[model samples]
Target: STAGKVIKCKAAVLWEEKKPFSIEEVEVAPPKAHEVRIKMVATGICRADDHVVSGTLVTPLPVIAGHEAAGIVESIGEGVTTVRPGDKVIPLFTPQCGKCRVCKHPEGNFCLKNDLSMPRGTMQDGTSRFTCRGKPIHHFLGTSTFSQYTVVDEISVAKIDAASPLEKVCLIGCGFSTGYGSAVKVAKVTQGSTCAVFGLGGVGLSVIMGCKAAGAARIIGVDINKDKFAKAKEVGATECVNPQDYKKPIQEVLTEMSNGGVDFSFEVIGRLDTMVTALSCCQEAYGVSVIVGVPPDSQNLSMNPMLLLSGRTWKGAIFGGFKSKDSVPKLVADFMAKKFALDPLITHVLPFEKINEGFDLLRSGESIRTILTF
Candidate 1:
């Protein structure tokens, strides 16, 4: 049995920043106390991972780099209670330690134990469970789903329905949850309202799906890639606009199209300028703008306070404001109930060995969500 034993498995390892990942056979150590080892079933190639490759999102080098995945718990370390061997689970990029103050807050979903603010690329104990060629390799976002097997803190693992299909719901681990929750939970997008979503990637499209589910009358999709428009409309976008089509600022164009401003605006691209534009395109009074993208760490947001003084609301959320451990399972259950469809978001499926090609699809703007199956 693999239980209580170190397992050697293949993983996509990024040895340096701004470099492509190298598939390597790595030794995954057994989970320590309060941890669980998962045999990854499926993972999604997300832009966040590419951010690390492009040096946009910084993490330790020589890390196993995938956060969005669904897996089965292969074993558990001593003191692990929430999950056990054979449990179907999803890895939470944003962990929810239920004992944390933020976890206890009724409206707050950002837990105190979250590694996002300062990614250490290790377990809570400041050590890594991966090694290749006798050198220790770090974890990425504490999930590290790029590996065939990974060890994560119990608090970062979400147990889902046994019947859940790992292929599609893996998106619930990150992209879908982040975008859907931003609209349904954070913004509380009202029915019959007007909405504009910047960046027609997977998350942006998910936001449109959320807005549609919320019963919004009109959803506008904005992107430089007009090819994304057809898929956007399929997900309930009433119309689509290209920023390059007009020389005027996209926000002004949106304002003119929506009769002053839209009721809700979302910036899914991790650009500071687009974030400001999303905020500016919304109605001065009662318009809500949500930032759903992860921007570069080195940049800062500079905006006038008068933009907010006019009664507009500007907010940003990680993991779509979901309490990972508690909410992810429920979202999976909802998916099982057929409340919504994840089919539109996924554009390709490939074996884990084709991960580089998957990244190519994303980099070339050819695919929305590519599920990598092991």
Candidate 2:
């Protein structure tokens, strides 16, 4: 059983950039100090993972590749207190090291201890516990839940109720939380206000859901893919507009649709132009723009800067403003309370063996969320 020792299991490993993951057997070592090892039960395939595979987002490679996972804590190292063996938990890619200066502040969720440069996939110790065929494989964001087992820093996990379904709540580990929190928390969406969400993917639709929760008068969804519109509308999107149908830019169409501008707009497509469009489509006075998409690291956005002079505010969100360790449990609680919607956003579920196929579904823009279950 490998009890009290390293365990061997099958995992999806990305050996190189711009390549498909190889489902191969690998070794998972025991957790070190302040670390926890988990038996992953469910994980959601996200666009960010797709970006990592496509080399669209610069990141460390030669590591296990999946996040947005939920599992049961199988073991823990010394000094670990957030969870214990048998605890149901979700690991956070954006960790919350509470002692960090940025973490203590109210404005951001970017933890200082995290190596966001992603030059190495290991933890603070800069070593990996995963190996295959006598070669070392680095950790991916300290939580390579693509494997059946993964180790993560204590601060990276949020213990949840055992009754919660891992298949569904696993999404809060990433996209659902990010997109929903952008509107409900970061943007501080108000009641009876106009809203626009630029993208019909998981996060964008969650923004529409958040707008509905906030009582937005009009939740306009924009996307070139008409297939996503039905799902978007099912999740509270008031109107759907296909950018391909209009000769004018979507921002212009939305501006006219909402009578000059929307009260709030979210850029969830990760395009520099969409970010600008999000800002421009806001109400001329007192509108707010929130960027929830992870654009290419090197991509830069240029605007007239005078656009802000009209009283529009620009903001960015990471991890959806929820302190992973501190707040994710409550998010899960809310989900159980039926305060948050999970089913409409999750369109497919597949066995772990079909993970590569799940990636295809994600890349083709056919699935909102494809949860892979062990």
Predicted model with the maximum lDDT: 1
Which candidate number maximizes TM-score? Answer: 1
Q: List the candidates' TM-scores in order.
A: 0.99, 0.97
Q: Which stretches of candidate 1 lie over 4 Å from their true place?
A: none
User: How close to the true structure is residue 234 of candidate 2, measured as C-alpha lDDT?
Assistant: 91
Number of clashes found in candidate 1: 0
Residue 45's lDDT within candidate 1 is 93
RMSD vs true structure, all candidates: 0.8, 1.2
In candidate 1, what are the lDDT values of residues 146-169, reduced to their tens digit? 999999999999999999999999
Can you list the residue pairs that collide in candidate 1? none
How accurate locally is residue 114 in candidate 1, as Cα lDDT from 0 to 100? 75
Write model 2 residue lDDT over 1-374, tens digit each, in one string: 54469999889988887767899899988889998989999999988888878777666768787879899999999899879899999998888889989889987787877655555788768888888878888776667889989889887889998899999999999888999889999999999999999999998988998899999989999998999999888989889999889999888999999999999999998888889999999987899999988788787778998899989999997877877777789999999999988999888999998899999998888898999999
Candidate 1: Cα lDDT at 133 = 83
